[PDB]
């Protein structure tokens, strides 16, 4: 047979780790994205881009080390090592923050190579591609938060850094500046993820608890072989449970397991639609008539207007040290503040 | 002070999709009743 | 002209009504007040 056919045999050779055609894209890019995150969090600074310390070498724990976004001085540049702002010179490419784009552009093709891997396994193993469909959610969250969100904002500075505390403030960045919990696209996302952990806890519990006696051991885990033709939990008994406890229960295993596919996945889509809202700053920030009536009645307070005062706490206090390049100098009489604290 | 066509956009955004999905249910119940010949045709 | 060898029945269960209504009514609880402002 041909040359390409022999190449096709040898990467599709069944061994301990399957390589595949997608593995020509996955295994270089997924190694470097995971490798560049480890080197950037152990050695490389934020000191010239954010003015922070973010590395295990400088003082950070696991919780505060981060591969950090470049400066706003660089715009949306790709920060190529050979590029016009690095010009080779790996030392200068790290201090400008080139590793963050290095991780984010190899994490992008690593996720492409991992979804393509789920198509390639599913063909040759001969099975329906619903893992590749269910993985398209985590692609959408990555692309919309780490790529589509900065590319509508001022530069790459506003995507979150790859680190534990550095994401934690991106939670509190989008709260203060963007009122991110109020976006109903995000509320559908929370319902999908909490409802997804709900279904993982339910279907785990009911299967373990409608099990059949298949042995005399008090341990029940050893009474299963994978080649069985029968069911190991009573679906009739499990339907009689929830229909009589909750009122409403499943009656298909096919509709159940699609529903466990569906709920976490469509949480991540509807949430990732709304983060393309803030990329271009179209956001559910205020209700108008709710905010009218407050400005004509000083009597009228809601929890909603309580949140706006907390939002201008985050907006005003953080921004002097949030964006250091824009050189916010805030007088202490300017800074909004309650009584005594 | 409250916005204006939202009284339209909610109630026509409820009822027109709600009444649509009713009728894919009314369609089958008639189709399953036309299948098994009973007192209804 | 002619009858098709394509045309088929379209179905929706009783539960799929209840999913489908409760989809529309609960999205109308969410996206109501944002439209009202």
């Amino acid at each position: 047979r041909g040359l390409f056919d022999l190449v096709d045999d040898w990467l599709k050779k069944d061994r301990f780790v399957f390589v595949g055609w997608s593995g020509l894209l996955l295994f270089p890019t997924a190694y470097l994205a995971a490798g560049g995150w480890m080197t950037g969090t152990t050695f490389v600074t934020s000191w010239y881009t954010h003015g922070l310390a973010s590395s295990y070498l400088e003082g950070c724990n696991f919780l505060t080390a981060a591969v950090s976004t470049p400066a706003n001085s660089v715009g949306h540049s790709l920060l190529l090592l050979w590029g016009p702002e690095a010009q080779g010179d790996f030392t200068r490419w790290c201090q400008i923050g080139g590793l963050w784009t290095f991780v984010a552009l190899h994490g992008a093709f690593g996720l492409i190579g991992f979804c393509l891997r789920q198509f390639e396994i599913a063909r040759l193993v001969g099975i329906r591609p619903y893992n590749a469909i269910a993985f398209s959610g985590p692609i959408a969250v990555f692309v919309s938060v780490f790529l589509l969100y900065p590319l509508g904002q001022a530069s790459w500075f506003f995507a979150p850094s790859f680190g534990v505390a550095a994401i934690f403030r991106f939670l509190l960045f989008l709260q203060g500046f963007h009122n991110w919990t109020l976006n109903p696209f995000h509320m559908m996302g929370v319902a999908g993820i909490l409802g997804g952990a709900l279904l993982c806890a339910i279907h785990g519990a009911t299967v373990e608890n409608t099990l059949f006696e298949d042995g005399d051991a008090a341990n029940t885990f050893r009474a299963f072989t994978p080649t069985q033709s029968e069911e190991t939990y009573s679906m009739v008994t499990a339907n009689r449970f929830w229909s009589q406890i909750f009122g409403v229960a499943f009656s298909n295993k096919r509709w159940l397991h699609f529903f466990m596919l569906f709920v976490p996945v469509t949480g991540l889509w509807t949430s990732s639609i709304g983060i393309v809202g803030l990329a271009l700053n179209l956001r559910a920030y205020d209700f108008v008539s709710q905010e009218l009536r407050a400005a004509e009645d000083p009597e009228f307070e809601t929890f909603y207007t309580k949140n706006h005062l907390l939002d201008e706490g985050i907006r005003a206090w953080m921004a002097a040290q949030d964006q250091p390049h824009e050189n916010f100098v805030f007088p202490e009489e300017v800074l909004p503040r309650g009584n005594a604290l | 002070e409250v916005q204006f066509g939202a009284y339209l956009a909610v109630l026509l955004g409820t009822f027109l999709p709600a009444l649509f999905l009713v009728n894919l249910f009314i369609q089958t119940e008639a189709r399953k009743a036309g299948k098994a010949g009973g007192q209804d045709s | 002209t002619g009858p098709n060898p394509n045309k088929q029945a379209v179905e929706l269960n009783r539960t799929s009504l209840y999913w489908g209504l409760l989809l529309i009514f609960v999205l109308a609880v969410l996206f109501s007040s944002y439209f009202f402002n």
Binding site: - | - | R14, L21, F25, S32
Partner: peptide
């Protein structure tokens, strides 16, 4: 007048849940 629309939809969901529990399509063993 939008508190009408709010309570119509909240009671609207509460009605749909009532029909979904007590008027459900029962599953049969057959």
């Amino acid at each position: 007048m939008e508190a009408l629309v709010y309570t119509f939809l909240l009671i609207g969901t509460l009605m749909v849940i009532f029909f979904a529990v007590f008027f459900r399509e029962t599953p049969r063993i057959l």
